[PDB]
Design an enzyme around this catalytic site. Structure first.
Site, PDB file in Angstrom:
ATOM      1  N   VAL A 195      -5.099 109.386-118.941  1.00  0.00           N
ATOM      2  CA  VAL A 195      -5.247 110.140-120.084  1.00  0.00           C
ATOM      3  C   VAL A 195      -5.614 109.353-121.268  1.00  0.00           C
ATOM      4  CG1 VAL A 195      -5.149 112.206-121.231  1.00  0.00           C
ATOM      5  CG2 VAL A 195      -4.051 112.048-118.988  1.00  0.00           C
ATOM      6  N   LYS A 211      -9.634 117.246-125.798  1.00  0.00           N
ATOM      7  CA  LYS A 211      -9.970 118.448-125.148  1.00  0.00           C
ATOM      8  C   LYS A 211      -8.764 119.293-124.893  1.00  0.00           C
ATOM      9  CE  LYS A 211     -13.581 116.099-124.425  1.00  0.00           C
ATOM     10  NZ  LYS A 211     -14.544 115.167-123.780  1.00  0.00           N
ATOM     11  N   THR A 271     -26.948 125.269-104.779  1.00  0.00           N
ATOM     12  CA  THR A 271     -25.990 124.497-104.044  1.00  0.00           C
ATOM     13  C   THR A 271     -25.248 125.310-102.973  1.00  0.00           C
ATOM     14  OG1 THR A 271     -25.540 122.679-105.596  1.00  0.00           O
ATOM     15  CG2 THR A 271     -23.609 123.862-104.680  1.00  0.00           C
ATOM     16  N   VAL A 322     -26.500 127.112-100.849  1.00  0.00           N
ATOM     17  CA  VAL A 322     -27.281 127.114 -99.658  1.00  0.00           C
ATOM     18  C   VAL A 322     -26.963 125.922 -98.823  1.00  0.00           C
ATOM     19  CG1 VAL A 322     -29.474 127.201 -98.634  1.00  0.00           C
ATOM     20  CG2 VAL A 322     -28.915 128.493-100.760  1.00  0.00           C
ATOM     21  N   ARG A 339     -16.770 135.614 -94.065  1.00  0.00           N
ATOM     22  CA  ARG A 339     -15.731 135.014 -93.274  1.00  0.00           C
ATOM     23  C   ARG A 339     -15.817 135.499 -91.815  1.00  0.00           C
ATOM     24  NH1 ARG A 339     -12.348 130.799 -95.418  1.00  0.00           N
ATOM     25  NH2 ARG A 339     -10.863 131.570 -93.828  1.00  0.00           N
ATOM     26  N   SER A 348      -8.004 126.601 -88.615  1.00  0.00           N
ATOM     27  CA  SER A 348      -6.923 127.520 -88.958  1.00  0.00           C
ATOM     28  C   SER A 348      -6.833 128.543 -87.831  1.00  0.00           C
ATOM     29  CB  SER A 348      -7.289 128.245 -90.224  1.00  0.00           C
ATOM     30  OG  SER A 348      -8.692 128.493 -90.150  1.00  0.00           O
ATOM     31  N   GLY A 364     -13.828 130.481 -91.580  1.00  0.00           N
ATOM     32  CA  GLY A 364     -15.176 130.288 -92.136  1.00  0.00           C
ATOM     33  C   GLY A 364     -16.258 129.774 -91.145  1.00  0.00           C
ATOM     34  N   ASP A 390     -19.797 124.106 -84.812  1.00  0.00           N
ATOM     35  CA  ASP A 390     -19.894 122.706 -84.529  1.00  0.00           C
ATOM     36  C   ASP A 390     -19.185 122.326 -83.295  1.00  0.00           C
ATOM     37  OD1 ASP A 390     -20.957 122.874 -87.164  1.00  0.00           O
ATOM     38  OD2 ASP A 390     -19.521 121.340 -87.985  1.00  0.00           O
TER      39      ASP A 390
HETATM   40 NA    NA Z   1     -25.034 123.685-100.040  1.00  0.00          NA
END
Ligand code: NA
Ligand code: NA
Length: 327
Positions: free
Chosen positions: A57, A64, A93, A95, A141, A172, A181, A248
């Site tokens: 810190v 801030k 991102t 994608v 999902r 999971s 996912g 995978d």
């Molecule tokens: Na991506």
DNA sequence: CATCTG
DNA sequence: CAGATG
């Protein structure tokens, strides 16, 4: 956990942006230790200076925190949330295949949206391409009810190709989970281990089988031990076809399956604690092995494991059903 | 860490 | 080969 939440949150937005939009790995890394420590902190940060006192810190962060505490908002946070450029980056991102890096390149070229992307399908490589083609499915999902059908298939085919194959669906999905996912399969064969010099076939044969029967749809990346694909459960009696799912498959030497299996099954928290306990018990654990800890500081030599049981046993612990591996 | 791209 | 992505 909720007492310095906003702070740790704003801090997280800030960190992220540094890294993603600007290139500020340092700054980014800065906001991060900060949020971690404030996150650990036991009281209610009532001011800048108060926090400042903490390590990591410094002065601008403190500043801030001050403004945020002072008023429910932050200018910079407000400026960044609007900025189209930053927004694009956050979007592109999403994608699969597009990282921040690339997100910058495209934005600078003007590709800021999904359409933009379609139009410029030339600028995208295969991964990205796929990623674009299944943006929608990708973000959906995976209901365990599908998971089971999936698992059912993969295992049956793996079996056919070799009786000796050992497959497991970690994730999971394995710890209970009503949905997931992506599909993660750990693979091994007796004929593949630590020393055993290679056997790519081992992974290639299955992938093949999977595509044979059409479960695997596309290839994201195919190496000699790790395959990254897309799969899909056969659309029944046409009216309802399924989404495309990430999948995978990885080969593992038989001599480090369970540690892997254990490992990938999670949760992160379960691991750690287990990891920590192993440590007390005079051991070590990582993704591939469990090792007897010497006293000179450290020391190794792979303990021999035939199940997730062998592992616990070592650290002398209660065998945990995967469901209760939660924390 | 493993694979890809260029 | 450096560098990106997952
Ligand atoms: Na991506
Ligand atoms: Na460099």
């Amino acid at each position: 956990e909720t007492l310095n939440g906003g702070i740790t949150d704003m801090l997280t937005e800030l960190a992220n942006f540094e890294k993603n939009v600007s290139q500020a790995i340092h700054k980014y890394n800065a906001y991060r230790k900060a949020a971690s420590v404030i996150a650990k902190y036991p009281h209610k940060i009532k001011s800048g200076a108060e926090a400042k006192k903490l390590p990591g810190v410094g002065t601008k962060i403190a500043e801030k925190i001050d403004e945020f505490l002072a008023t429910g908002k932050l200018r910079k946070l407000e400026k960044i949330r609007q900025d189209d450029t930053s927004s694009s980056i956050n979007f592109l991102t999403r994608v699969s295949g597009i990282g921040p890096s690339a997100a910058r390149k495209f934005v600078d070229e003007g590709i800021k949206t999904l359409e933009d992307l379609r139009k410029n399908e030339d600028k995208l490589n295969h991964h990205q391409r796929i990623g674009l083609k299944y943006f929608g499915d990708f973000e959906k999902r995976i209901p365990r009810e599908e998971m089971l059908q999936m698992q059912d298939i993969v295992l049956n085919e793996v079996k056919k190709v070799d009786s000796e194959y050992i497959a497991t669906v970690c994730g999971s999905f394995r710890r209970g989970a009503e949905s997931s996912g992506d599909m993660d399969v750990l693979l091994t064969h007796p004929s593949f281990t630590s020393e055993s010099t290679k056997q790519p076939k081992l992974l290639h044969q299955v992938v093949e089988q999977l595509q044979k029967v059409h479960f695997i749809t596309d290839t994201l990346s195919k190496g000699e031990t790790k395959f990254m694909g897309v799969c899909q459960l056969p659309s029944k009696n046409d009216e309802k076809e399924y989404p495309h799912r990430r999948i995978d498959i990885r080969l593992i030497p038989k001599d480090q399956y369970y540690c892997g299996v254990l490992y990938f099954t999670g949760s992160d928290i379960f691991n750690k604690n287990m990891r920590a306990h192993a440590l007390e018990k005079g051991f070590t654990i990582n993704e591939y092995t469990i090792r007897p800890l010497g006293v000179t500081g450290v020391a190794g030599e792979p303990l021999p494991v035939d199940s997730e049981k062998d592992i616990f046993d070592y650290i002398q612990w209660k065998y945990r059903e995967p469901k209760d591996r939660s924390e």
